[PDB]
Design a protein around this nucleic acid. Structure first.
Length: 272
RNA sequence: AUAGCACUCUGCAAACACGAAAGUGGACGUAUAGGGUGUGAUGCCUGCCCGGUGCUGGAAGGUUAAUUGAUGGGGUUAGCG
């Protein structure tokens, strides 16, 4: 419902939050949770490789089944839960044989629904099937690129691709970036679209909200000295240069794709 | 610096960064995500110019490297003298 907070303080004047009343309010399912440590954007040499990372709240990792390799055994949804590691919600599945797992929750899925995976699964949201058995024109998510590896494409909140055609050994899908590409017909996908589609409606409101999520301040290159950045130096404000990164790579329009091995998989570019 | 705004890059063995390499961060994330650049709550808004430099897409005409080696010109000596 996108609730706006009342302007009781200047830090609250501009807070837009998203509320979903159906999320489970207790602790997560313990056998499927494991520890996760903060990195600070540093690698095994100890140097910073990604800037603006650090701090934030402590988080546990939820083990999510991306492979969906329990074929033919129906499962029932127990609850929908909030996951701090991603923007989508997750669903807890209880199988007819007692095993419990976590999956990315499709939009509309509620406690009590039934899901399945395999060649013979019926066409209902949350069911996992090979693309060869998927009806043409379907809206899908959680698309797998290598046989047996699991879902890699269209996993974020509100994400969807759609299947325009299938011929030979390759199905044609269009992605949310606007791109056409082919996928092997034996790779799997899931029926429907990802939940939490209102995720991008939130307004943080203040700097502390970004600090809670673990983002450190960005300093403009214009604000430094020549020894630090190509944009540095000068008396007063002055750009006087075509924009580049701290390492000298142009920032407006210059393309960076280099891989020559997957080029034959891409039919139509989205005007990169 | 900041929440907000915009441009641009990146289809995943991602772009990008560290490192001589192996490898590591990005991220046990997947375009509602991640990196770079500028502006800076909010209200009203944000005009003209693509000639220059840059970027993006074209063309197969001119010019041009390694490589290849067609012809031509010298040195030497069998022989003729």
């Amino acid at each position: 419902p996108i609730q706006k907070c009342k302007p009781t303080s200047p830090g609250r004047r501009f807070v837009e939050k998203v509320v979903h009343d159906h999320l489970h309010k207790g602790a997560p399912y313990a056998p499927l949770v494991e520890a996760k440590k903060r990195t600070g954007g540093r690698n095994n040499n100890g140097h910073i490789t990604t800037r603006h990372v650090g701090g934030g709240h402590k988080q546990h990792y939820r083990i999510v089944d991306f492979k969906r390799n329990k074929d033919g055994v129906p499962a029932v949804v127990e609850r929908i839960e909030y996951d701090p590691n991603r923007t989508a919600h997750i669903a807890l599945l209880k199988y007819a044989d007692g095993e419990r797992r976590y999956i990315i929750a499709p939009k509309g899925l509620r406690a009590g629904d039934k899901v399945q995976s395999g060649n013979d699964a019926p066409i209902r949201p949350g069911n996992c099937l090979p693309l060869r058995n998927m009806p043409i024109g379907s809206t899908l998510h959680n698309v797998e690129l290598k046989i047996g590896k699991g879902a890699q494409l269209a996993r974020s909140a509100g994400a969807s691709v759609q299947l325009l055609g299938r011929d030979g050994s390759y199905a044609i899908i269009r992605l949310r970036s606007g791109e056409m590409r082919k996928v092997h017909v034996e790779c799997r996908a899931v029926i429907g679209e990802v939940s939490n589609q209102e995720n991008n409606l939130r307004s943080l409101g203040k700097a502390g909200a970004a600090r809670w999520r673990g983002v450190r301040p960005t300093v403009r290159g214009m604000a430094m000295n020549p020894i630090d950045h190509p944009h540095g130096g000068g008396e007063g404000r002055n750009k006087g240069i075509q924009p580049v990164s701290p390492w000298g790579q142009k920032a407006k329009g210059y393309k960076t794709r280099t891989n020559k091995r997957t080029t034959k998989m891409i039919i139509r570019d989205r005007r990169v």
